Amino acid sequence: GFLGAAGSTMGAASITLTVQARQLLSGIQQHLLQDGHWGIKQLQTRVLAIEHYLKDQQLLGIWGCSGKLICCTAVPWNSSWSNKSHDEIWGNMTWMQWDREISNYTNTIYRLLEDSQNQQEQNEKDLL
């Protein structure tokens, strides 16, 4: 259920990923918890999962996308990242392939997202 509509036409996957994302609700044994090092490893796994979830949530919050599974932003798309005008992206291309396409640009985009929210926050305190 995690990867429903994987490799499956980002348009269709996005028709499903928002529907499934809410449906999946993914993320957030005495012997295996007291004997040996099993319990410590379970704790490490659980803490690492919590840390990764909080990292994703913090990245969403920094960009102004807090509490949203879909969020539009003020960063315009630069053709230097990809020159496909929705023909493949929401057409013949899948989320995994699309991730492979912009694997090198991702950090750059984050900065722009970050920068955009800064301006809005400044504007938010200047218009008030």
Partner: protein, 431 residues
């Protein structure tokens, strides 16, 4: 036209994580106590192509570490046979020797003379030998370390165990019926847990495994390299029936305050060597098919199946465990054939009680006997071959590195971390 951030995106990366064991006084039931779902859903990912590599798979390393870990933990609270590294005095039985020794008692200021039958493999001649006469001897691997007794009440019988991914990860299973190890797979399916894998410990021949769906599959990291081990997944099983015919009578003594030592008090009737009967016609068919497959992978070569070289006992024999009895069988009579592209077989077996598992030194285990005779019907499902490396290729039985056994069941599975955060263009701004 404009950036947009999605959460819940179906994108994943190759990742390593601690998979938790789950299965439907067995050690594999105490551990792996998490229950498994009835009818675990397998979701087939359409049009998804994924690079699998059965070698360099961290699932195999995790299973290796977990298996030995359980064995060590299971032997931790058991009786240490430190009082029994004393001078034995053995004089043959009116292979096996009728040793005698002064063992310690619960009371420190007391001793007890004990007569026990020990296999000759488990003993080292302290003094010069003497045919029928009683010579001095010592238990093997005493000087290396203390020998821990496997608890009679704790059984190490393998059961099907499933390795489930933790939350935030998933397992990808290749559904290709003919797929060599390192390469792409087109028919991928997501799962939360592996199939029922029985952690059977053996060498040369893989027992009680999972049969290949298509033909016999030959998987090896580098076939042209003669150092790597070739794993042959059979598409049909071959029946092998192992048996110890000796009718043991098992005694026990107290070697300390609550420390019970179990040994073979006597053998009733005749003393006969243990043996394995493997079905002849099925074995000949299996070896012919494997020879043809190797000829396909090694063209213009005669495929010779010969016995292993003259190494140690643990590596030159089909080693296995049957109800705690540790057999080592001489499979030279099996791999005694040759394929040119242009009625049971009886295998003698020795049995040991002092075992050095996982190719470790300084941690020996004493496997106590079982009263009566012993039989085990196991299905040979795979082979571990090594190419000798002429116009002729020589393949010998291999093994010893238990990694391969786990890999033989974990070639299908890959662990992936889900990256739900994604970015894509859209046709609208923030506003």
């Amino acid at each position: 036209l404009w950036v947009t951030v999605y959460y819940g995106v179906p994108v994943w990366k190759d990742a390593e994580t601690t998979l938790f064991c789950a299965s439907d006084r067995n050690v594999w039931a105490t551990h792996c106590c998490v229950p498994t779902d009835p009818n675990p859903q397998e979701m087939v990912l359409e049009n998804v192509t994924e690079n699998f590599n059965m070698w360099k798979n961290d699932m195999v390393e995790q299973m290796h570490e977990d298996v030995i870990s359980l064995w060590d933990q299971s032997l931790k609270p058991c009786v240490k046979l430190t009082p029994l590294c004393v001078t034995l005095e053995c004089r043959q039985v009116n292979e096996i020797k009728n040793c005698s020794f002064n063992a310690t008692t619960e009371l420190r200021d007391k001793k007890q003379k004990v007569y026990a039958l020990f296999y000759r493999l488990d003993i080292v001649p302290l003094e010069e030998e003497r045919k029928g006469n009683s010579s001095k001897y010592r238990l093997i691997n005493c000087n290396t370390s203390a020998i821990t007794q496997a608890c009679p009440k704790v059984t190490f019988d393998p059961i099907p165990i499933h390795y489930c991914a933790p939350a935030g990860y998933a397992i990808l299973k290749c559904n290709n019926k003919t797929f060599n190890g390192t390469g792409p797979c087109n028919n991928v399916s997501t799962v939360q847990c592996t199939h029922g894998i029985k952690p059977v410990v053996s060498t040369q021949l893989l027992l009680n495994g999972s049969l290949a769906e298509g033909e016999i599959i030959i998987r090896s990291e580098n076939l042209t390299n003669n150092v790597k081990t070739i794993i042959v997944h059979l598409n049909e099983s071959v029946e092998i029936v192992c048996t110890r015919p000796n009718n043991n009578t098992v005694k026990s003594i107290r070697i300390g305050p609550g420390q019970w030592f179990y040994y073979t008090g006597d053998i009733i009737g005749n003393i006969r060597q243990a043996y394995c009967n493997i079905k002849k016609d099925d074995w000949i068919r299996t070896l012919q098919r494997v020879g043809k497959k190797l000829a396909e992978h090694f063209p213009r070569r005669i495929i010779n199946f010969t016995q292993p070289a003259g190494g140690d006992l643990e590596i030159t024999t089909h080693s296995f465990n049957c109800r705690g009895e540790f057999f080592y069988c001489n499979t030279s009579s099996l791999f005694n054939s040759t394929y040119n592209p242009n009625l049971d077989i009886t295998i003698p077996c020795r049995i040991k009680q002092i075992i050095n598992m996982w190719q470790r030194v300084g941690q020996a285990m004493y496997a106590p006997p079982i009263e009566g005779n012993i039989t085990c019907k196991s299905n040979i499902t795979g082979l571990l071959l090594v190419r000798d490396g002429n116009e002729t290729e020589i393949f010998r039985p291999g093994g010893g590195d238990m990694r391969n056994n786990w890999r033989s069941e974990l070639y299908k599975y890959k662990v992936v971390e889900i990256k739900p955060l994604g970015i894509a263009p859209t046709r609208c701004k923030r506003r």
